[PDB]
């Protein structure tokens, strides 16, 4: 391949392979032969977020426009991929165009959620939120700062000295009902096709 | 403040407003100068751990010499501090109090690393490039200029793709 691959994923037939380069472009490779089958693009249709401490806009941010996990469907005809973005993607394999794009979480305290930041928070020098507000807590323990400066996905939450990035690490399909689950920063999310399990009381007094 | 007189000087024997002993010679700032850290408290974020190295390095020097825990735990300290590259050598034990500076952990900072590799001309231009979002450490583009990068992560810093400054070189 010509660019930096990661997060490999095979078809269950084992004759085609989904690859995620640094460009975001997923490629599909033959295994019985050597050439590339076709490649689907993800650097355009990825919802990425601009952090409050970001100094570049999300349209030309290279934060999260690749995929940290790829999975084939149980026909091998669809693929759900997920990265360090707010966006989870469902590409069709032979028709080669994404079917649906999914938010994992819509949270202001999660960092890369928002596409566009609100300009009322961009003050004279600095963000309005990047000011250390832990020093005004009534409690001593919450006023105590233990944050080592440049910790990225380290041990504890308080020691980033940052908001948590919206990132989704691991992606898998269910065999049966095509349900896909992805363990996010928030936790394990479940999408499914088990529709109308939404419980519906009827004729309530 | 005044180039004060011969008669003023002897009466104001101990006073100063610029260099204090609690202000410890403004030594920290000379490291805040040479490595261009944004906040002041990054220095004391290294120097609060830096004594904590020595505070373990001192009392592991107080154990009996061929205590088989002592030579093992010191090796576990030194391989760790050698993976992060905050000391040049690992053969001697004496770097754990002599080489552990704020400048030594602060020359394992990210723009120092790019400033060594001469992708940037000066230090602050690399900080400006991290702020512009031009750099990445293997997988991830990093926005933060204050990245602690280990010795083994040092090969993973490239320019980020499709940029205007990677095409500049």
């Amino acid at each position: 391949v010509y660019s930096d691959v990661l997060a490999l994923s095979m078809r269950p037939d084992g004759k085609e392979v989904a690859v995620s380069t640094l460009k975001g472009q997923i490629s599909i490779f033959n295994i019985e032969d050597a050439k590339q089958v076709g490649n689907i693009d993800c650097r355009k249709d990825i919802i990425s977020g601009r952090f409050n401490q970001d100094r570049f806009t999300a349209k030309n941010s290279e934060r999260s426009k690749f995929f940290t996990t790829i999975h084939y469907s149980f026909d091998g005809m669809a693929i759900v991929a997920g990265g360090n973005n707010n966006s989870i993607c469902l590409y069709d394999v032979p028709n080669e165009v994404l079917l649906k794009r999914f938010i994992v979480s819509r949270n202001m305290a999660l960092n890369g959620t928002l596409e566009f930041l609100n300009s009322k928070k961009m003050t004279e020098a600095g963000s309005l939120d990047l000011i250390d507000d832990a020093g005004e807590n009534s409690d001593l323990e919450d006023r105590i700062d233990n944050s080592l400066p440049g910790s990225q996905r380290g041990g504890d939450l308080s020691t980033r000295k940052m908001r948590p990035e919206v990132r989704v690490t691991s992606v898998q399909f269910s065999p049966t009902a095509n349900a896909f689950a992805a363990a996010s920063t928030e936790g394990l999310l479940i999408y499914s096709t088990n529709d109308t399990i939404l419980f519906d009381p009827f004729d309530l007094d | 403040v005044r180039k004060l007189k011969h008669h003023e000087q002897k009466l104001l024997k101990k006073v100063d407003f610029l260099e204090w002993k609690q202000d410890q010679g403004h030594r920290d700032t000379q490291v805040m100068r040479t490595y261009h850290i944004q906040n002041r408290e990054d220095y004391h974020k290294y120097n609060r751990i830096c004594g904590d190295i020595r505070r373990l390095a001192n009392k592991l020097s107080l154990l009996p010499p061929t205590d088989p825990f002592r030579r093992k735990h010191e090796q576990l300290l030194l391989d760790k501090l050698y993976a992060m590259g905050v000391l040049t050598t690992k053969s001697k034990i004496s770097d754990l109090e002599n080489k552990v500076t704020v400048s030594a952990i602060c020359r394992r900072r990210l723009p120092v690393i790019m400033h060594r590799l001469k992708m940037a001309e000066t230090i602050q231009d690399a900080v400006k490039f991290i702020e512009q979002g031009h750099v990445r450490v293997g997988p991830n583009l990093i926005n933060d200029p204050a990245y602690l990068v280990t010795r083994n992560m040092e090969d993973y810093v490239t320019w980020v793709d499709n940029s205007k400054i990677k095409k500049t070189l």
Binding site: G126 | L18, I37, Q38
Partner: peptide, 25 residues
């Protein structure tokens, strides 16, 4: 429109003339 690397400008030991070690020249 703020410049990048907004750093804490603080006391220069090699440039501040208020220092008596730099009171000479």
């Amino acid at each position: 429109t703020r410049k990048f690397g907004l750093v804490k400008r603080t006391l220069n030991t090699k440039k501040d003339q208020r220092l008596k070690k730099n009171q000479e020249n």
